[PDB]
Design a protein around this nucleic acid. Sequence first.
RNA 1: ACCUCGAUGUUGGAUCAGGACAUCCCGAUGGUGCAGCCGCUAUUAAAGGUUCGUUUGUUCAACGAUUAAAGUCCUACGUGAUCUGAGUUCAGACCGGAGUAAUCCAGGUCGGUUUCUAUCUACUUUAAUUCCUCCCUGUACGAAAGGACAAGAGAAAUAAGG
RNA 2: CCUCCGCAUAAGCCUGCGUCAGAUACUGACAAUUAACAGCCCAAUAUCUACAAUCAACCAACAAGUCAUUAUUACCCUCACUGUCAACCCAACACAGGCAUGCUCAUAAGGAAAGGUUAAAAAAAGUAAAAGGAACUCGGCAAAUCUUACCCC
RNA 3: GCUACCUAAGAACAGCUAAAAGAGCACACCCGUCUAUGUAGCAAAAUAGUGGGAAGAUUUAUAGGUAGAGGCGACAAACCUA
Lengths: 152, 48, 45, 108
Amino acid sequence: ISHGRVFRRMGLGPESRIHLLRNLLTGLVRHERIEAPWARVDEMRGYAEKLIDYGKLGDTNERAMRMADFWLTEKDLIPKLFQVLAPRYKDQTGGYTRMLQIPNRSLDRAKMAVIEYKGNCLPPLPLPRRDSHLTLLNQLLQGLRQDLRQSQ
Amino acid sequence: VARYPPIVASMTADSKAARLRRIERWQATVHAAESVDEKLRILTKMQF
Amino acid sequence: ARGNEYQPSNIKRKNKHGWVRRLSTPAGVQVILRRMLKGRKSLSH
Amino acid sequence: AAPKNRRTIEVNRCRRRNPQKLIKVKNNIDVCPECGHLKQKHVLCAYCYEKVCKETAEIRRQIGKQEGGPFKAPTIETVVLYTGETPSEQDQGKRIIERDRKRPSWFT
RNA sequence: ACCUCGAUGUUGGAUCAGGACAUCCCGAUGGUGCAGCCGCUAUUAAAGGUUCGUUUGUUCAACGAUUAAAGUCCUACGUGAUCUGAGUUCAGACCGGAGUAAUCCAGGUCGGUUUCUAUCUACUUUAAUUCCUCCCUGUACGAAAGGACAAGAGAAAUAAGG
RNA sequence: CCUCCGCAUAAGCCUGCGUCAGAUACUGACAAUUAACAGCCCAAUAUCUACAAUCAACCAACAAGUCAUUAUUACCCUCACUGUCAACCCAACACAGGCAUGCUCAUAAGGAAAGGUUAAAAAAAGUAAAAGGAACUCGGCAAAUCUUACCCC
RNA sequence: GCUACCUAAGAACAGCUAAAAGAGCACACCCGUCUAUGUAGCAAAAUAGUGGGAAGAUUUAUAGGUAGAGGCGACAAACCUA
Ligand SMILES: [Mg+2]
Ligand SMILES: [Mg+2]
Ligand SMILES: [Mg+2]
Ligand SMILES: [Mg+2]
Ligand SMILES: [Mg+2]
Ligand SMILES: [Mg+2]
Ligand SMILES: [Mg+2]
Ligand SMILES: [Mg+2]
Ligand SMILES: [Mg+2]
Ligand SMILES: [Mg+2]
Ligand SMILES: [Mg+2]
Ligand SMILES: [Mg+2]
Ligand SMILES: [Mg+2]
Ligand SMILES: [Mg+2]
Ligand SMILES: [Mg+2]
Ligand SMILES: [Mg+2]
Ligand SMILES: [Mg+2]
Ligand SMILES: [Mg+2]
Ligand SMILES: [Mg+2]
Ligand SMILES: [Mg+2]
Ligand SMILES: [Mg+2]
Ligand SMILES: [Mg+2]
Ligand SMILES: [Mg+2]
Ligand SMILES: [Mg+2]
Ligand SMILES: [Zn+2]
């Protein structure tokens, strides 16, 4: 019975789970785009968002500095977290990460995903785009919208 | 006012930089050693 | 616990099943002769 | 416990050809409008993703060359500039990663 | 001495219990050496229940405290491909005894390896009972001692389901 | 993140993750380990050799102990041979076992418990637990604590 | 070349308490009390914990010896290549 359990059981235990997520998140902060097993990316997405929030909190905040020091195993990224990412997302309030499924791993056919910080310098992902407004169905719905607007 | 942690390699990781940092830890113990006897003992204890 | 009864040592090997020991006694000479008659590629050890 | 009798090929065929065993036809496959290769609707296109990954690998290799060593992550934004391109006013103050090829059309 | 010795694993205990009724308790009823309270006996009733402990390997029995009761049985003395091995029942050893001895004992006593990944069958979500408290009532009954039913009110405990 | 280890010698094995090419830590070819370390010794005939070791100094012993030459005669005139690799040996196996010694006493050396996902039962290991505290059980077995006293043999 | 005993000449035994100890606690090391797991297993006897000894009748590397009407044995009819 796992009603309401929100954390996956990963690695060799709770500490190993935290460390795996920490390594994935350090890689994400360094490269701005990481491909890893789908479940691990899903688990680490929330922590990525939380680091962005802690970076928004600012350098001077000792609590934020401690959190960044713990989570970023490579200490050169803490200046990055606080001076490149948080300023980038100052305008935003959330949704800093884009996660998208990727063709299964060739080795063990694992469900893989790619997670990136939005607005990174890297080439854009082949994002799935909704159907063009000029399609038949969308044009008919546009006609509906125009008719309703005219009625009101 | 912002106390960034020092940008050094991990002392326990399995990497070239971590190995160099462990070597630096050893050499720091040698430096801290006061007596020349202790210095020589630390410098020569490992037989390779 | 068992199985590793063979603790190899060339000194014991040659002093126990060597050509010299086999020729030392008539019984060992006949052992060598039996091996030769059978056509063994290794008469002694 | 051990089998009391050999299971016949008829029973075995029943078991191993039951539709629960058989592979399920997938109807979520579709053609990628960009390259025209097949892709599962929810999954990203393999061909396009490989293009992006190879370009990312080139860019990251240039990034590593410019960094010159471990723990040298810049404290400023980064911009990739291709041959025949010059930094814009926004690009000013950003680490320039220069790629020796024409900008990919998909890349913008 | 009929199946099984090219193995049907064995006494108690744990777990889960299926069943019978020749009913221990709860229900209904007849009799009584049934005044009442306890009871005894018989007909009907197997839906439900039928305790925890001290020694002892004990099933039992004895004892302690309870209970409405701590029922008699069958189920390979139910159930070791679910479990335990304390007894018994190998190989070691001591005491008493037998023998010249080896060794043995309807004797005691200390120790002593519990295998199996399930092929098939079968199966895996089917309106509750009881005790007690008050009152009735210190009434009916009875010389007293003692002492009820029924009706009513309240409390719980177990069991099932959440 | 782990470090039981690890590095050498011995013993054992005998080319057994070096390069290249083919396949699909395999096959074929090519290469390699260089003595100072170690092994491989000693001209005769007699003749010597009571007094441990233990920081050898006190003491202290008993179990009474690994370490020595001289006399004469011969004789220099001349640095060979062999081991040197490895991820290794004995256990039918890339076996959780066995495996002497010197240093390192946690390491500068050596390594990776998780193929991916889910987090059902049963099972294994561990941690926590209301009140009680052996009522369990053959037995306090196991676990937790650190805890008295009396008996047989 | 295991094992029982022996022969030659070797080696190991931290630390603490005590004091010349077949002394105590306790590493390495030797053993294998009890439990769990395992039972075609990692293992034809192991693993984890727990535990006995751990300066001695100790443990152990090397070479040699005793051979089946036998050897060896602090007798368990032990051990002598599962
Ligand atoms: Mg897992
Ligand atoms: Mg041996
Ligand atoms: Mg018969
Ligand atoms: Mg007859
Ligand atoms: Mg049969
Ligand atoms: Mg009846
Ligand atoms: Mg019977
Ligand atoms: Mg028994
Ligand atoms: Mg007797
Ligand atoms: Mg017994
Ligand atoms: Mg015992
Ligand atoms: Mg069993
Ligand atoms: Mg089963
Ligand atoms: Mg692994
Ligand atoms: Mg798995
Ligand atoms: Mg408790
Ligand atoms: Mg008891
Ligand atoms: Mg007590
Ligand atoms: Mg009991
Ligand atoms: Mg115990
Ligand atoms: Mg000592
Ligand atoms: Mg002692
Ligand atoms: Mg005897
Ligand atoms: Mg006997
Ligand atoms: Zn595509």
